[PDB]
Amino acid sequence: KIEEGKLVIWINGDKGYNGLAEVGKKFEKDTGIKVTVEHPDKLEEKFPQVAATGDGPDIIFWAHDRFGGYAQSGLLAEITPAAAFQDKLYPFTWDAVRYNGKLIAYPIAVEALSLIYNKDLLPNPPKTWEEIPALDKELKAKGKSALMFNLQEPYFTWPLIAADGGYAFKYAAGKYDIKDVGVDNAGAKAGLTFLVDLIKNKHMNADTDYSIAEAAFNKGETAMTINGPWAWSNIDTSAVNYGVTVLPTFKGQPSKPFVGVLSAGINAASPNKELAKEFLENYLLTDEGLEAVNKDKPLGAVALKSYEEELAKDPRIAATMENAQKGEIMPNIPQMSAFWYAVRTAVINAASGRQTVDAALAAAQTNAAAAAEYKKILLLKGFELMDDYHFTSIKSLLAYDLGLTTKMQEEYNRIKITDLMEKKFQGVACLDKLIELAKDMPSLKNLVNNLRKEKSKVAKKIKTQEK
Ligand SMILES: OC[C@H]1O[C@H](O[C@H]2[C@H](O)[C@@H](O)[C@@H](O)O[C@@H]2CO)[C@H](O)[C@@H](O)[C@@H]1O
Protein backbone atom coordinates (compact mmCIF):
# COMPACT_ATOMS: atom_id res chain seq x y z
CA LYS A 1 0.00 0.00 0.00
CA ILE A 2 2.79 2.39 0.93
CA GLU A 3 5.08 2.89 -2.04
CA GLU A 4 8.60 1.53 -1.64
CA GLY A 5 11.47 3.78 -2.70
CA LYS A 6 10.10 7.23 -1.76
CA LEU A 7 9.04 9.00 1.43
CA VAL A 8 5.59 10.47 2.08
CA ILE A 9 5.41 12.83 5.06
CA TRP A 10 2.33 14.26 6.77
CA ILE A 11 2.58 17.44 8.88
CA ASN A 12 -0.06 19.88 10.10
CA GLY A 13 -1.04 22.85 7.96
CA ASP A 14 0.11 25.37 10.58
CA LYS A 15 3.74 24.17 10.48
CA GLY A 16 6.62 24.89 8.12
CA TYR A 17 5.79 22.26 5.50
CA ASN A 18 7.41 24.20 2.64
CA GLY A 19 10.64 24.39 4.62
CA LEU A 20 10.35 20.68 5.35
CA ALA A 21 9.92 20.02 1.61
CA GLU A 22 13.21 21.87 1.06
CA VAL A 23 14.92 19.45 3.44
CA GLY A 24 13.33 16.70 1.39
CA LYS A 25 14.78 18.16 -1.80
CA LYS A 26 18.27 17.99 -0.31
CA PHE A 27 17.60 14.38 0.69
CA GLU A 28 16.56 13.58 -2.88
CA LYS A 29 19.68 15.22 -4.32
CA ASP A 30 21.91 13.09 -2.08
CA THR A 31 20.02 9.81 -2.39
CA GLY A 32 17.67 9.95 -5.39
CA ILE A 33 14.77 9.26 -3.03
CA LYS A 34 11.84 11.61 -3.63
CA VAL A 35 10.22 13.15 -0.55
CA THR A 36 6.60 14.30 -0.76
CA VAL A 37 5.25 16.52 2.05
CA GLU A 38 1.47 16.74 2.54
CA HIS A 39 -0.66 18.60 5.10
CA PRO A 40 -4.03 16.80 5.22
CA ASP A 41 -7.01 18.20 7.10
CA LYS A 42 -7.81 16.49 10.43
CA LEU A 43 -4.38 14.91 10.25
CA GLU A 44 -4.35 13.52 13.80
CA GLU A 45 -7.58 11.61 13.11
CA LYS A 46 -6.79 10.62 9.53
CA PHE A 47 -3.44 9.02 10.35
CA PRO A 48 -4.83 6.36 12.74
CA GLN A 49 -7.67 5.61 10.30
CA VAL A 50 -5.40 4.85 7.35
CA ALA A 51 -2.43 3.41 9.25
CA ALA A 52 -4.68 0.81 10.93
CA THR A 53 -4.83 -1.02 7.58
CA GLY A 54 -1.21 -0.43 6.60
CA ASP A 55 -1.83 2.69 4.47
CA GLY A 56 -0.75 6.31 4.97
CA PRO A 57 2.48 8.30 5.12
CA ASP A 58 5.93 6.94 5.87
CA ILE A 59 6.40 9.69 8.50
CA ILE A 60 3.76 11.40 10.67
CA PHE A 61 4.30 14.71 12.49
CA TRP A 62 2.19 15.76 15.48
CA ALA A 63 2.63 16.89 19.04
CA HIS A 64 3.68 13.98 21.24
CA ASP A 65 0.37 13.74 23.16
CA ARG A 66 -1.22 11.69 20.36
CA PHE A 67 1.66 9.25 19.96
CA GLY A 68 0.99 6.89 22.89
CA GLY A 69 -2.40 6.13 21.38
CA TYR A 70 -0.81 5.49 17.98
CA ALA A 71 1.81 3.21 19.55
CA GLN A 72 -0.76 1.28 21.60
CA SER A 73 -2.56 0.68 18.29
CA GLY A 74 0.63 -0.70 16.75
CA LEU A 75 0.83 2.10 14.19
CA LEU A 76 4.42 3.19 14.87
CA ALA A 77 7.84 1.65 14.36
CA GLU A 78 10.11 1.62 17.40
CA ILE A 79 12.87 4.23 17.23
CA THR A 80 16.36 3.02 18.22
CA PRO A 81 18.90 5.77 17.52
CA ALA A 82 22.56 5.25 18.29
CA ALA A 83 23.66 6.80 21.57
CA ALA A 84 25.70 9.35 19.61
CA PHE A 85 22.53 10.67 18.01
CA GLN A 86 20.42 10.40 21.18
CA ASP A 87 22.93 12.63 22.99
CA LYS A 88 22.29 15.44 20.46
CA LEU A 89 18.75 16.05 21.78
CA TYR A 90 17.69 17.16 25.26
CA PRO A 91 16.79 14.15 27.50
CA PHE A 92 13.39 15.57 28.44
CA THR A 93 12.35 15.64 24.80
CA TRP A 94 13.12 11.92 24.47
CA ASP A 95 10.95 11.37 27.58
CA ALA A 96 8.03 12.93 25.73
CA VAL A 97 8.25 10.30 22.95
CA ARG A 98 8.86 7.26 25.19
CA TYR A 99 5.88 4.95 25.66
CA ASN A 100 5.90 1.71 27.67
CA GLY A 101 9.70 1.78 27.62
CA LYS A 102 10.04 2.28 23.85
CA LEU A 103 10.94 5.38 21.86
CA ILE A 104 8.11 5.82 19.35
CA ALA A 105 9.10 9.06 17.57
CA TYR A 106 11.87 11.60 17.05
CA PRO A 107 11.33 14.81 19.09
CA ILE A 108 11.66 17.98 17.02
CA ALA A 109 10.63 21.06 18.99
CA VAL A 110 9.08 22.24 22.25
CA GLU A 111 5.89 24.26 21.78
CA ALA A 112 4.15 26.49 24.27
CA LEU A 113 1.60 29.24 23.87
CA SER A 114 2.56 32.83 24.68
CA LEU A 115 0.78 36.16 24.86
CA ILE A 116 1.37 38.01 21.58
CA TYR A 117 0.65 41.72 21.64
CA ASN A 118 0.64 44.76 19.36
CA LYS A 119 3.15 47.22 20.83
CA ASP A 120 1.64 50.23 19.05
CA LEU A 121 -1.83 49.61 20.49
CA LEU A 122 -0.54 48.26 23.81
CA PRO A 123 2.99 49.28 24.82
CA ASN A 124 2.58 47.66 28.25
CA PRO A 125 0.70 44.35 27.96
CA PRO A 126 -1.46 43.31 30.91
CA LYS A 127 0.04 41.11 33.60
CA THR A 128 -3.38 39.73 34.68
CA TRP A 129 -6.39 38.27 32.93
CA GLU A 130 -8.50 40.36 35.29
CA GLU A 131 -7.31 43.63 33.70
CA ILE A 132 -8.38 42.58 30.21
CA PRO A 133 -12.09 43.56 30.48
CA ALA A 134 -11.23 47.19 31.31
CA LEU A 135 -8.56 47.24 28.59
CA ASP A 136 -11.14 46.01 26.06
CA LYS A 137 -13.54 48.79 27.06
CA GLU A 138 -10.78 51.33 26.46
CA LEU A 139 -9.79 49.83 23.10
CA LYS A 140 -13.39 49.47 21.88
CA ALA A 141 -13.66 53.26 22.23
CA LYS A 142 -10.86 53.45 19.62
CA GLY A 143 -12.49 50.92 17.27
CA LYS A 144 -10.26 48.02 18.41
CA SER A 145 -10.51 45.08 20.81
CA ALA A 146 -8.22 43.74 23.54
CA LEU A 147 -7.92 40.03 22.80
CA MET A 148 -8.87 37.42 20.19
CA PHE A 149 -7.73 33.80 20.15
CA ASN A 150 -9.00 30.43 18.92
CA LEU A 151 -11.95 29.32 21.06
CA GLN A 152 -12.69 26.17 19.05
CA GLU A 153 -9.65 24.17 20.19
CA PRO A 154 -9.31 23.57 23.96
CA TYR A 155 -5.51 23.79 23.65
CA PHE A 156 -5.83 27.61 23.64
CA THR A 157 -8.15 27.87 26.66
CA TRP A 158 -6.28 25.25 28.72
CA PRO A 159 -3.70 27.76 30.10
CA LEU A 160 -6.56 29.58 31.84
CA ILE A 161 -8.44 26.45 32.98
CA ALA A 162 -5.23 25.09 34.48
CA ALA A 163 -4.08 28.34 36.10
CA ASP A 164 -6.05 28.02 39.38
CA GLY A 165 -5.88 24.22 39.56
CA GLY A 166 -7.44 22.34 36.64
CA TYR A 167 -5.50 19.34 35.36
CA ALA A 168 -5.89 16.43 32.94
CA PHE A 169 -4.68 13.23 34.66
CA LYS A 170 -3.08 13.14 38.09
CA TYR A 171 0.56 12.06 37.97
CA ALA A 172 0.84 9.73 40.97
CA ALA A 173 3.98 7.79 41.96
CA GLY A 174 5.55 7.68 38.51
CA LYS A 175 2.48 7.17 36.34
CA TYR A 176 -0.69 8.88 35.31
CA ASP A 177 -3.83 7.83 37.17
CA ILE A 178 -6.37 7.52 34.36
CA LYS A 179 -9.16 7.59 36.95
CA ASP A 180 -8.09 10.90 38.57
CA VAL A 181 -9.16 13.67 36.16
CA GLY A 182 -9.01 17.30 37.17
CA VAL A 183 -11.31 19.12 34.77
CA ASP A 184 -14.21 19.79 37.16
CA ASN A 185 -12.41 20.97 40.28
CA ALA A 186 -12.80 24.50 41.63
CA GLY A 187 -9.76 25.78 39.73
CA ALA A 188 -10.97 24.49 36.36
CA LYS A 189 -14.43 25.94 36.98
CA ALA A 190 -12.98 29.33 37.92
CA GLY A 191 -10.91 29.55 34.74
CA LEU A 192 -13.67 28.43 32.40
CA THR A 193 -16.12 30.76 34.15
CA PHE A 194 -13.78 33.68 33.46
CA LEU A 195 -13.66 32.75 29.77
CA VAL A 196 -17.46 32.50 29.59
CA ASP A 197 -17.74 35.84 31.41
CA LEU A 198 -15.50 37.45 28.77
CA ILE A 199 -17.98 36.22 26.16
CA LYS A 200 -21.08 37.24 28.13
CA ASN A 201 -19.60 40.75 28.54
CA LYS A 202 -18.85 41.03 24.79
CA HIS A 203 -15.07 41.04 25.16
CA MET A 204 -14.82 37.88 23.04
CA ASN A 205 -17.07 35.99 20.62
CA ALA A 206 -17.72 32.27 21.05
CA ASP A 207 -17.40 31.67 17.29
CA THR A 208 -13.83 33.02 17.05
CA ASP A 209 -11.55 30.38 15.52
CA TYR A 210 -7.89 30.22 14.51
CA SER A 211 -8.35 32.01 11.17
CA ILE A 212 -10.54 34.80 12.57
CA ALA A 213 -8.18 35.56 15.46
CA GLU A 214 -5.06 35.43 13.27
CA ALA A 215 -6.55 37.77 10.67
CA ALA A 216 -7.74 40.21 13.33
CA PHE A 217 -4.38 40.40 15.08
CA ASN A 218 -2.31 40.58 11.90
CA LYS A 219 -4.60 43.27 10.46
CA GLY A 220 -4.14 45.37 13.62
CA GLU A 221 -7.74 45.13 14.81
CA THR A 222 -7.17 43.40 18.16
CA ALA A 223 -4.38 44.25 20.56
CA MET A 224 -3.52 40.72 21.71
CA THR A 225 -3.72 37.10 20.69
CA ILE A 226 -2.62 33.77 22.15
CA ASN A 227 -0.67 31.50 19.84
CA GLY A 228 2.46 29.43 19.40
CA PRO A 229 5.75 30.07 17.57
CA TRP A 230 4.43 28.83 14.20
CA ALA A 231 2.33 32.03 14.09
CA TRP A 232 5.27 34.45 14.25
CA SER A 233 6.29 34.51 10.61
CA ASN A 234 2.85 35.62 9.39
CA ILE A 235 2.99 38.48 11.91
CA ASP A 236 6.47 39.32 10.60
CA THR A 237 5.02 39.81 7.11
CA SER A 238 2.16 41.92 8.50
CA ALA A 239 2.46 45.58 9.48
CA VAL A 240 2.25 44.73 13.21
CA ASN A 241 5.07 45.66 15.60
CA TYR A 242 4.60 42.76 18.00
CA GLY A 243 6.04 41.31 21.17
CA VAL A 244 5.87 37.83 22.67
CA THR A 245 5.57 37.63 26.44
CA VAL A 246 4.45 35.71 29.51
CA LEU A 247 0.75 34.86 29.60
CA PRO A 248 -1.37 36.88 32.05
CA THR A 249 -1.87 35.50 35.54
CA PHE A 250 -5.29 34.38 36.78
CA LYS A 251 -6.20 34.76 40.46
CA GLY A 252 -2.53 35.66 40.91
CA GLN A 253 -1.39 32.30 39.46
CA PRO A 254 0.53 31.90 36.19
CA SER A 255 -1.38 30.59 33.20
CA LYS A 256 -0.27 26.99 32.65
CA PRO A 257 -0.13 26.00 28.97
CA PHE A 258 0.10 22.37 27.95
CA VAL A 259 3.59 21.95 26.49
CA GLY A 260 3.74 19.94 23.25
CA VAL A 261 6.79 18.34 21.66
CA LEU A 262 6.44 18.32 17.89
CA SER A 263 7.48 14.77 17.03
CA ALA A 264 7.99 12.64 13.92
CA GLY A 265 6.93 8.99 13.95
CA ILE A 266 7.57 6.25 11.40
CA ASN A 267 4.57 4.26 10.15
CA ALA A 268 4.84 0.64 11.31
CA ALA A 269 3.73 -0.37 7.79
CA SER A 270 6.37 1.71 5.99
CA PRO A 271 8.67 -0.26 3.66
CA ASN A 272 11.08 2.71 3.89
CA LYS A 273 12.00 2.68 7.60
CA GLU A 274 15.77 2.83 6.97
CA LEU A 275 15.38 5.83 4.64
CA ALA A 276 12.93 7.53 7.00
CA LYS A 277 15.45 7.21 9.83
CA GLU A 278 18.20 8.59 7.62
CA PHE A 279 16.08 11.59 6.67
CA LEU A 280 14.95 12.38 10.20
CA GLU A 281 18.31 11.91 11.98
CA ASN A 282 20.75 13.22 9.41
CA TYR A 283 18.76 15.70 7.32
CA LEU A 284 15.99 17.16 9.49
CA LEU A 285 17.61 16.99 12.97
CA THR A 286 20.59 19.11 11.95
CA ASP A 287 21.19 22.84 12.29
CA GLU A 288 20.58 23.37 8.57
CA GLY A 289 17.51 21.12 8.46
CA LEU A 290 15.75 22.76 11.39
CA GLU A 291 16.70 26.21 10.07
CA ALA A 292 15.00 25.39 6.76
CA VAL A 293 11.76 24.52 8.58
CA ASN A 294 12.13 27.39 11.07
CA LYS A 295 12.47 30.08 8.38
CA ASP A 296 9.11 28.94 6.97
CA LYS A 297 7.22 28.71 10.28
CA PRO A 298 9.14 28.94 13.58
CA LEU A 299 9.40 25.65 15.48
CA GLY A 300 9.78 26.98 19.01
CA ALA A 301 12.56 25.73 21.30
CA VAL A 302 14.09 22.91 19.31
CA ALA A 303 15.10 19.53 20.71
CA LEU A 304 18.50 19.69 18.96
CA LYS A 305 20.97 21.15 21.47
CA SER A 306 23.34 22.69 18.91
CA TYR A 307 20.62 24.71 17.18
CA GLU A 308 18.72 25.60 20.37
CA GLU A 309 21.86 27.34 21.63
CA GLU A 310 21.37 29.80 18.77
CA LEU A 311 17.60 30.16 19.11
CA ALA A 312 17.73 30.65 22.90
CA LYS A 313 19.10 34.19 22.39
CA ASP A 314 15.80 35.26 20.78
CA PRO A 315 13.52 36.99 23.34
CA ARG A 316 10.52 35.31 21.68
CA ILE A 317 12.00 31.89 22.43
CA ALA A 318 12.88 33.05 25.94
CA ALA A 319 9.20 33.96 26.37
CA THR A 320 8.13 30.59 24.92
CA MET A 321 10.22 28.73 27.48
CA GLU A 322 9.13 30.97 30.34
CA ASN A 323 5.55 30.04 29.51
CA ALA A 324 6.52 26.38 29.03
CA GLN A 325 8.15 26.27 32.47
CA LYS A 326 4.96 27.49 34.09
CA GLY A 327 2.94 24.73 32.38
CA GLU A 328 3.07 20.96 32.09
CA ILE A 329 4.37 18.66 29.37
CA MET A 330 1.34 16.83 28.02
CA PRO A 331 0.94 13.15 28.83
CA ASN A 332 1.36 10.89 25.83
CA ILE A 333 -0.96 8.18 27.22
CA PRO A 334 -3.70 6.72 24.97
CA GLN A 335 -6.42 8.34 27.10
CA MET A 336 -5.38 11.79 25.86
CA SER A 337 -7.65 11.45 22.82
CA ALA A 338 -10.71 10.97 25.03
CA PHE A 339 -9.57 13.79 27.34
CA TRP A 340 -9.26 16.29 24.48
CA TYR A 341 -12.62 15.29 22.96
CA ALA A 342 -14.39 15.68 26.30
CA VAL A 343 -12.77 19.03 27.06
CA ARG A 344 -13.38 20.37 23.55
CA THR A 345 -17.09 19.62 23.97
CA ALA A 346 -17.14 21.27 27.41
CA VAL A 347 -15.46 24.51 26.31
CA ILE A 348 -17.57 24.85 23.16
CA ASN A 349 -20.81 24.08 25.04
CA ALA A 350 -20.00 26.51 27.86
CA ALA A 351 -18.84 29.29 25.52
CA SER A 352 -21.99 29.00 23.38
CA GLY A 353 -24.39 28.83 26.32
CA ARG A 354 -25.46 25.28 25.44
CA GLN A 355 -24.39 24.16 28.94
CA THR A 356 -23.58 25.90 32.18
CA VAL A 357 -19.93 25.81 33.22
CA ASP A 358 -20.67 23.31 36.00
CA ALA A 359 -22.68 21.01 33.75
CA ALA A 360 -20.17 21.17 30.91
CA LEU A 361 -17.19 20.34 33.09
CA ALA A 362 -19.02 17.65 35.09
CA ALA A 363 -19.72 15.80 31.84
CA ALA A 364 -16.16 16.22 30.57
CA GLN A 365 -14.83 14.92 33.89
CA THR A 366 -16.98 11.80 33.86
CA ASN A 367 -16.45 11.08 30.17
CA ALA A 368 -12.67 11.57 30.19
CA ALA A 369 -12.47 9.12 33.10
CA ALA A 370 -15.12 6.63 32.03
CA ALA A 371 -15.65 6.70 28.24
CA ALA A 372 -13.50 3.58 27.80
CA GLU A 373 -15.58 1.68 30.37
CA TYR A 374 -18.92 2.62 28.79
CA LYS A 375 -17.50 1.62 25.40
CA LYS A 376 -16.41 -1.76 26.81
CA ILE A 377 -19.95 -2.38 28.07
CA LEU A 378 -21.51 -1.24 24.80
CA LEU A 379 -19.25 -3.59 22.82
CA LEU A 380 -19.05 -6.69 25.01
CA LYS A 381 -22.49 -6.58 26.65
CA GLY A 382 -24.30 -4.95 23.73
CA PHE A 383 -23.04 -5.47 20.21
CA GLU A 384 -21.18 -8.75 20.76
CA LEU A 385 -24.38 -10.29 22.19
CA MET A 386 -26.47 -9.60 19.07
CA ASP A 387 -26.29 -11.43 15.78
CA ASP A 388 -25.29 -9.97 12.42
CA TYR A 389 -28.94 -9.51 11.43
CA HIS A 390 -29.67 -7.30 14.44
CA PHE A 391 -26.32 -5.50 14.14
CA THR A 392 -27.14 -4.56 10.54
CA SER A 393 -30.55 -3.32 11.68
CA ILE A 394 -29.03 -1.21 14.47
CA LYS A 395 -26.57 0.35 12.00
CA SER A 396 -29.58 1.23 9.83
CA LEU A 397 -31.36 2.85 12.79
CA LEU A 398 -28.18 4.79 13.64
CA ALA A 399 -27.52 5.85 10.03
CA TYR A 400 -28.68 9.44 10.45
CA ASP A 401 -27.10 9.86 13.90
CA LEU A 402 -23.69 8.50 12.85
CA GLY A 403 -23.82 9.53 9.18
CA LEU A 404 -23.56 6.02 7.78
CA THR A 405 -23.74 5.49 4.03
CA THR A 406 -24.87 2.13 2.67
CA LYS A 407 -21.26 1.00 2.21
CA MET A 408 -20.41 2.12 5.75
CA GLN A 409 -23.46 0.31 7.10
CA GLU A 410 -22.05 -2.71 5.25
CA GLU A 411 -18.36 -2.48 6.16
CA TYR A 412 -18.35 -1.15 9.73
CA ASN A 413 -17.83 -3.76 12.45
CA ARG A 414 -19.01 -3.67 16.06
CA ILE A 415 -15.76 -2.12 17.32
CA LYS A 416 -15.98 0.74 14.81
CA ILE A 417 -19.67 1.36 15.54
CA THR A 418 -18.94 1.34 19.29
CA ASP A 419 -16.28 4.02 18.74
CA LEU A 420 -18.54 6.09 16.49
CA MET A 421 -21.58 5.70 18.73
CA GLU A 422 -19.79 6.94 21.86
CA LYS A 423 -18.32 9.89 19.95
CA LYS A 424 -21.90 10.91 19.13
CA PHE A 425 -23.46 9.81 22.45
CA GLN A 426 -20.70 10.41 24.99
CA GLY A 427 -20.34 8.30 28.12
CA VAL A 428 -23.53 6.77 29.50
CA ALA A 429 -25.46 8.24 26.55
CA CYS A 430 -24.23 5.47 24.25
CA LEU A 431 -25.70 2.79 26.54
CA ASP A 432 -28.98 4.72 26.83
CA LYS A 433 -29.14 4.99 23.04
CA LEU A 434 -28.66 1.26 22.43
CA ILE A 435 -31.22 0.45 25.14
CA GLU A 436 -33.66 2.82 23.45
CA LEU A 437 -33.04 1.40 19.97
CA ALA A 438 -33.36 -2.23 21.11
CA LYS A 439 -36.29 -1.83 23.53
CA ASP A 440 -38.79 -3.25 21.05
CA MET A 441 -36.74 -5.92 19.27
CA PRO A 442 -38.13 -9.27 20.50
CA SER A 443 -34.90 -11.28 20.17
CA LEU A 444 -32.95 -8.51 21.96
CA LYS A 445 -35.18 -8.02 25.03
CA ASN A 446 -32.87 -10.22 27.12
CA LEU A 447 -29.80 -8.32 25.89
CA VAL A 448 -31.50 -5.03 26.79
CA ASN A 449 -32.34 -6.14 30.34
CA ASN A 450 -28.68 -6.89 31.11
CA LEU A 451 -27.56 -3.56 29.63
CA ARG A 452 -29.79 -1.81 32.17
CA LYS A 453 -28.07 -3.85 34.89
CA GLU A 454 -24.66 -2.99 33.45
CA LYS A 455 -25.61 0.69 33.31
CA SER A 456 -26.53 0.59 37.00
CA LYS A 457 -23.30 -1.18 37.98
CA VAL A 458 -21.01 1.47 36.47
CA ALA A 459 -23.10 4.28 37.95
CA LYS A 460 -22.27 2.91 41.41
CA LYS A 461 -18.60 2.44 40.48
CA ILE A 462 -18.43 6.04 39.21
CA LYS A 463 -19.62 7.46 42.55
CA THR A 464 -17.23 5.37 44.65
CA GLN A 465 -14.46 6.90 42.52
CA GLU A 466 -15.38 10.52 43.32
CA LYS A 467 -15.60 9.99 47.10
O1 LIG B 1 -7.08 21.47 21.12
C1 LIG B 1 -6.65 20.20 21.57
C2 LIG B 1 -5.42 19.76 20.77
O2 LIG B 1 -4.31 20.43 21.33
C3 LIG B 1 -3.04 20.13 20.78
O3 LIG B 1 -2.97 20.54 19.42
C4 LIG B 1 -2.24 21.73 19.16
C5 LIG B 1 -0.85 21.36 18.64
O4 LIG B 1 -0.13 20.65 19.64
C6 LIG B 1 -0.09 22.61 18.21
O5 LIG B 1 1.10 22.23 17.52
C7 LIG B 1 -0.92 23.45 17.25
O6 LIG B 1 -0.97 22.81 16.00
O7 LIG B 1 -2.24 23.64 17.69
C8 LIG B 1 -2.98 22.50 18.06
C9 LIG B 1 -4.32 22.99 18.60
O8 LIG B 1 -5.13 23.41 17.52
C10 LIG B 1 -2.81 18.63 20.91
O9 LIG B 1 -1.53 18.30 20.42
C11 LIG B 1 -3.89 17.89 20.14
O10 LIG B 1 -3.67 16.50 20.27
C12 LIG B 1 -5.24 18.24 20.75
O11 LIG B 1 -6.25 17.61 19.95
Residue numbers in the entry: 2 to 468
Q: Please, what does the article write about this entry?
A:
MBP is one of the most commonly used protein expression tags due to its exceptional performance in enhancing the solubility of the target proteins. The death domain superfamily is a structural motif found in many proteins that are involved in physiological, as well as pathological processes. To explore broader crystallization space, we designed a series of protein expression vectors V28E1-V28E6 containing helical linkers of different lengths.
Indeed, both hNLRP12-PYD and hMNDA-PYD, two targets that failed to crystallize using fusion proteins expressed with the V28E vector, crystallized using fusion proteins expressed with these new vectors (V28E1-V28E6). Remarkably, we were able to crystallize and solve their structures using MBP-fusion proteins expressed with more than one vector. Similar to the hNLRP12-PYD, the human MNDA PYD domain was crystallized as MBP fusion proteins using three different protein expression vectors V28E3, V28E4, and V28E6. All of these fusion protein crystals diffract very well which led to their structure determination. Structural analysis shows that the designed “helical” linkers are slightly distorted probably attributed to crystal packing. Nonetheless, the target protein structures from all three different crystals are essentially identical with an rmsd of 0.30–0.40 Å, demonstrating again that the MBP fusion strategy enhances the crystallizability without alteration of the structural features of the target proteins. Structures of the hNLRP12-PYD and hMNDA-PYD determined with different linker sequences in different crystal lattices show no significant perturbation of the PYD structures.
